[PDB]
Design a binder for this molecule. Structure first.
Ligand SMILES: [Cl-]
Ligand SMILES: [Cl-]
Lengths: 41, 843, 843, 41
């Protein structure tokens, strides 16, 4: 479920090799998404 | 004359399940959102939802930043702490959400606060909801221990005294020990100006301060003042820049999901709208209602959860959001909406709050069973010119409450006779549905209390006469200025409780609490034999009260001392015009004093003293030794004696002998000795006649009293409300009793007359009379006993039944059986023809 | 009339080795102690003794304590830091020692100070004297870096400005960057009261403060003031308790060695006496001279080495030790001694100081070649009633100096006409032996300067008219109050240098220093073409001076800001009556202002301006471009031009055109613009006409000037002393020149007339005249050129030859050849019959 | 040269198992003694 999304170079939080790890999850309540900042593994 | 339901559909609906057919979500989306709502309320020391547990990301990133920020100014370290948390935190986006954002790495979680209370975090570590990994969290809590607010305040108090406060019997535990807190966020600054503007202001101030320090000739007696200012302004910039980036990273998540995950083209376009909102807001000024609601929620997250924990939801929401409601709904200049669109939006807000997991301690989850946290917003009231403040945004707020039917957030309505009828009817709709809110506060009374405190301003910049109208409930009971400036920033300023009933009980045992703590709770004021006259028991209680109230206020001021020095809040400081102008921390600058403290179970100790003076010292029927023996026996023997003490003249019976003592008891001891204390803001500490659910716990923490109570029999109905089953002259007499105190009212109304078409007129007539009697507060309970009993038998069929407990509302089925039976037992009051004439009704 | 040596034994002693037969230790013990003295002086960036290197125990134990004291109040953390150092430090006891104690783990070592300057410790890490193990020390320096005083002051200054100060050309580097410091320890409190008494005082104050905080009714606007006080008093207790334990553990070492190691029964009994002294002192009040001398040394170690580095040895030793000299020698009440016993004791003190390894930076070892550190004590002067302060303790101090012949410590004698002749003769004995000390300060001038500063006291508790007589030299040049209170606690208050010669040089190059730093040293005040009139070069220098002096004082006040907040000195605070009474830190409380700063090479820039006005703007002989070309060519060409600029009217020639400009230059720019600045203590910053050896270095750091100087030709003889080889009207004319400045004098006297029986009368006559001319300072050099030349050829035969360099004395053979030739080149002045009449002599 | 000397129980700095490690040394200058606090090896 781990999907890497490179942070745009014009973003306020942009750093070298930085990316958003967006993972889709779903429990008994409903579906949601989690975005965690990661640096090129 | 006939009490038929105004809606003919309710004629066939069984009375034991009336409130299961009242909810009516404006859209299908909010209907889904309530069904799948991630509730965070708890009962019997256990969360209702199974997935609720503590997070660790905040603890981790705050610890990392603190280690790395060693040596730097504390204000900047705190800004870097917030920055690191915001930058590295996992962000959450759920389905059907329009108002987005969260304060933890997981939507089922809640962050913790090791920088506040070591004990609080320790208790979660020893629970089923400990942050994971448990070993890392334990390492984090140990690292923060010497830096915690708790560890910094404790050395300046006798450990014996702190132990007495930690018992929570005569005194509430200090806020530095519990971590409990409140705040009134300057939302107005964020929505109007945006964060980029605040950064530019701070940066300009820094350049001016630096220019001054390099200005010939140098003056060492003045020039060094720029250091604290530059540090504060630099921290504001760091904090603001982090929030903007954090909000825009939240928006980027929406864009990503809409482009890579979401399959519904409707939702995709919606997520793109939300992405554009998060991108501009709160960096830029709000232009529409959607922007405003998102800014307000973002700001709420920082001020109440992320930067620091702060219980509450204090705000003047209608007045605050009105310019953006007007731009969107009325003028349709930006983000064109209908009134129903605004109703849906507020519905979604109530749900986000319902999903807001509070990282509060366990001890403050027991006093409020069946609830998540105390979220109280304020609407109505008057503007600067004393004119009506009610508008269509007010109605939208109230309609959304009635529709979605969530126990939280609760609402406070400031009632003035200037208030238009159309809004008042919406207020009635929520009450007639038994929501327990909006509770009603006296507008003029609160406004005057803002003017009084304004006089004690240290910098002479208290609230003006116009600004005094801009007040809200800080939490459950106390008023406080809202706006861009002079707002309360900490619970250290105002809040906390003291219990005269406990002070009186130990006054008859040489300061020793035998009933609860089984220890020395107060000073050795003397034994029963030393006490030879009634003047001695009046001075015995005095010294007990003086000693107790002194610790209550000193501990808050000491906390305030270290809060501004090590627990700086650069974000809150950045959105305050005062702090931004003077380059000071929110906890340091205190322009508008608001030192309150709550005397709970005051009437209980008041009535008891009357029975002591007459039966022991005047008539000499019983000695103090026999009375003490009767108490320590919990009225096992002395039954004729117990009914004799209850028979003694009480409060609210128009008894000259009784009322003459209580009056002298409130103005000299309870309010007099308490006014003598000056707090951090240079203002006096004035009492608050109210009870924030403490009476249920404290009542079980207080022993038997000469008012007729047994051991643990809880309690006083409210902070000034009459004892249960003592009001025998009708609901109008209850109005007569409360109005006597000039130097919180719980009431239960009958369901049939309220669900009828004549309901509003009768209710409105009561409110108008209530306002003329100068009563400060009043809340209403509209629910039949049969429905509550049916909820006890078949709880799975009564999930939407909401009742009013104390200063908050909760789902009846999420309340323990012991707690349920307490609320049920209260008698439903009816109005006679004599009562209607007293209210000056007109049908 | 005949100049034969007063001692017939000197008739046969070769003149090129006279000073090799002058030393005469009072006992065999002190003779051995000088021979085996662990000298700590250095030359050419290298220590003279081979075993001299830095220790690590202080760095280690201070780091350990700091990590463990996290969260605690900084004052207490600093006390715990000192405590950990004292508790765990290896103690040192040497043979023949009576005055015991040391400030490192090894008698050949010296501690370092990572809590001060990161750069300073870094330089030792990159040296042959790095603390061992080098890796641990590197780890320690890295840990302390963000906590260092240097790192806390730097962010509040433009990095460009700091770089200009770090060049040390126009401005001296700030003290937070170098770690350099000075202090005047309240020795009087330790000796009179003892440390146990100070602890009892602090403990009593704490109990009173705690009682106040629990006193009903509480006042948050006042009650929180007790927090800082309690923290300070608690730190005083921790610090004092550590010093007592440290001194008693030192005594236990003496007992152990006497019982298990020492084989000589004489030494054993002696070590037992020392053991008893260290046991009682400084815990108990001093009762005898031996106690006093040991207390003073212990106190010196803490205040100048262990608690913090502080260059200097400021004290009024004769007045300070007199009550204990009297009890021991005169009255023989406790520790009965002869006068010679006191002489031996002072001899041993001078040797302990000679062995005191200073953990000062390398940059401050170059400016004073051949020296360990600047140790300057003060004797003589007047008491509170203006009467003579000289006594037999004064003479004992002076005799011990003459006998043991150590370059350190140097002595300052406050001269008044009230001073008895017997003491003055002892002063002459040290001078006639060419020691270079005692230097002579004007008693009344210094006393008046204490009265003036007293007026600017922030708490209105400056030195009284009686207390103004109680002053000493802080370091080399400046006066300062001594006693139990109001003493200077930091160099941040007073000290530092500025160099007008460099300011003038860059004034003719648009603020660019081309000669030394090869960079922009000052503001772009304008080029040579913009400067069209003499009024423009007067304003160009003004802006250069204003900008420079502003940085000099602001950096000290900023340092002061963080010194009291993170570098608290609880021990110094404990022995100060002011700090103990008010519960404040030594750096925080500043009752007696003393803001000085040193204008060095002032006359050089003064004379240059006269040559500019007349030759360029009045006569138009040369343009500013040609003069600038002549300077940048280092007078390679324009030889007729160079001798013409030197020919221009100079200072000290009674020239109306010249003196009229210098007068306006000193009262308006140098002293005027500088007085406009107010420092931390609320007093003005007043100049000090002196030169603390900087002229030798700065002279090599300043370029060619229109006064006739070539590039690097160093320098001004003193701070006000005439240029070398310019005084051509005798020694009396030098007295005429210095006395002109009312809004340091170096002099060389002839050996034969001074070693004769007529020496004292001639010298005394000079001093009496010097005092009447209101000259502030004067020092004398009595040494023949032949002996210095012989010391250059055969250094191993001239180890005891001592000469006066600048503000200190040093062994001639321990001075580099380049430095030696500079001192030798100075012409020996002789007195004519006309000079004797001017001095009003009487033979 | 390492000699252990137990710290007296009445000393201000007395702790359990604490002792003074007194060692005699001598270089080219002269003889001296060093006292270092140690806790039972
Ligand atoms: Cl409240
Ligand atoms: Cl000085």
């Amino acid at each position: 479920c781990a999907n890497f999304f490179p942070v745009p170079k014009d973003a306020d939080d942009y750093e070298a090799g930085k990316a958003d790890c967006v993972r889709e999850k779903e429990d008994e309540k409903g579906k949601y998404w989690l975005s965690k900042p990661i640096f090129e593994n | 004359l006939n009490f038929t339901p105004e809606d003919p559909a309710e004629e066939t609906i069984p009375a034991d399940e009336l409130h299961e057919h009242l909810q009516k979500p404006s859209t299908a989306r909010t209907k889904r959102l309530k069904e799948r709502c991630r509730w965070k309320h708890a009962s019997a020391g256990e969360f209702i939802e199974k997935s609720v547990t503590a997070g660790i990301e905040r603890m981790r990133y705050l610890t990392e930043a603190h280690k790395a920020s060693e040596g730097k100014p504390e204000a900047i370290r705190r800004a870097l702490g917030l920055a690191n948390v915001l930058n590295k935190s996992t962000l959450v986006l759920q389905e059907d959400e329009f108002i987005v954002g969260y304060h933890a790495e997981d939507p089922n979680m809640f962050p913790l606060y090791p920088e506040l209370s070591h004990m609080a975090v320790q208790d979660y570590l020893r629970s089923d909801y400990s942050p994971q990994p448990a070993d890392e969290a334990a390492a984090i809590n140990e690292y923060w221990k010497p830096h915690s607010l708790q560890s910094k305040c404790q050395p300046y108090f006798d450990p014996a005294d702190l132990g007495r406060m930690y018992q929570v019997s005569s005194m509430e535990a200090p806020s530095f020990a519990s971590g409990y807190n409140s705040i009134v966020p300057p939302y107005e600054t964020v929505l109007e100006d945006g964060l980029l503007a605040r950064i530019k202001l701070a940066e300009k101030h820094i350049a001016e301060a630096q220019a001054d320090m390099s200005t010939f000739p140098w003056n060492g007696t003045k020039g060094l003042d720029n250091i604290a200012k530059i540090d504060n302004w630099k921290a504001m910039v760091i904090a603001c820049k982090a929030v903007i980036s954090w909000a825009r990273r939240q928006g980027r998540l929406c864009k990503i999901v809409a482009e890579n995950f979401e399959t519904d083209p409707k939702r995709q376009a919606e997520l793109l709208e939300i992405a554009d909102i998060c991108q501009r807001i709160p960096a830029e000024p709000c232009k529409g209602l959607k922007d405003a609601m998102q800014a307000k929620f973002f700001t709420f997250l920082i001020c109440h959860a992320i930067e620091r924990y702060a219980s509450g939801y204090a705000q003047k929401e209608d007045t605050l959001l009105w310019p953006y409601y007007k731009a969107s709904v009325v003028d349709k200049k930006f983000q064109p909406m209908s009134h129903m669109d605004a109703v849906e939006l507020v519905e979604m807000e109530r749900l986000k709050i319902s999903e807001h997991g509070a990282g509060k301690s366990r001890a403050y989850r027991e006093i409020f069973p069946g609830s998540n946290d105390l979220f109280i917003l304020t609407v109505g009231g008057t503007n600067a010119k004393g004119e009506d403040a009610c508008n269509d945004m007010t109605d939208a707020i109230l309609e959304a409450a009635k529709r979605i039917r969530t126990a939280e957030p609760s609402i406070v309505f400031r009632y003035s006779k200037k208030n238009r009828e159309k809004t008042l009817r919406w207020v009635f709709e929520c009450i007639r549905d038994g929501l327990g809110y909006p509770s009603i506060k006296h507008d003029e009374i609160g406004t005057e209390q803002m003017k009084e405190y304004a006089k004690f301003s240290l910098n002479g910049n208290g609230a003006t006469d116009e600004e005094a109208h801009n007040w809200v409930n800080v939490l459950c009971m106390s008023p406080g200025i809202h706006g861009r400036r002079k707002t309360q920033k900490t619970r250290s300023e105002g809040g906390g409780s003291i219990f005269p009933a406990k002070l009186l009980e130990i006054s008859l045992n040489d300061g020793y609490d035998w009933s609860y703590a089984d220890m020395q709770l107060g000073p050795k004021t003397g034994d029963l034999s030393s006490l030879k006259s009634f003047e001695d028991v009046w001075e015995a209680f005095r010294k007990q009260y003086q000693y107790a109230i002194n610790l209550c206020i000193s501990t808050k001021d000491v906390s305030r001392y270290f809060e501004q020095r090590f627990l700086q809040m650069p974000f809150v400081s950045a959105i305050d015009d005062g702090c931004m102008e003077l380059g000071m921390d929110a906890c340091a600058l205190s322009e508008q004093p608001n030192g309150w403290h709550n005397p709970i179970t005051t009437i209980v100790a008041a009535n008891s003293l009357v029975a002591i003076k007459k039966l022991v010292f005047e008539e000499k029927k019983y000695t103090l030794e026999q009375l003490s023996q009767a108490l320590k026996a919990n009225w096992e023997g002395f039954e004729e004696m117990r009914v004799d003490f209850k028979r003694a003249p009480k409060w609210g019976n128009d008894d000259d002998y009784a009322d003459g003592i209580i009056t002298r008891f409130y103005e000299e001891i309870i309010g007099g000795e308490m006014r003598k204390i000056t707090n951090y803001s240079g203002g006096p500490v004035m009492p608050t006649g109210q009870a924030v659910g403490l009476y249920m716990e404290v009542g079980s923490r207080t022993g038997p009293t000469p008012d007729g109570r047994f051991g643990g029999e809880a309690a006083d109905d409210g902070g000034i409300s009459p004892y249960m089953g003592t009001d025998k002259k009708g609901p109008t007499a209850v109005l007569r009793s409360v109005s006597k105190v000039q130097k919180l009212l719980n009431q239960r109304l009958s369901v049939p007359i309220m669900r009828s078409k004549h309901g509003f007129e009768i209710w409105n007539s009561y409110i108008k009379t209530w306002h003329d009697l100068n009563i400060d507060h009043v809340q209403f309970n509209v629910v039949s006993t049969d429905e509550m009993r049916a909820a006890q038998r078949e709880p799975e069929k009564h999930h939407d039944l909401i009742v009013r407990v104390s200063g908050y509302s909760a789902r009846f089925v999420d309340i323990p059986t012991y707690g349920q039976n307490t609320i049920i037992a209260r008698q439903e009051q009816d109005f006679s023809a004599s009562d209607l004439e007293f209210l000056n009704v007109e049908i």
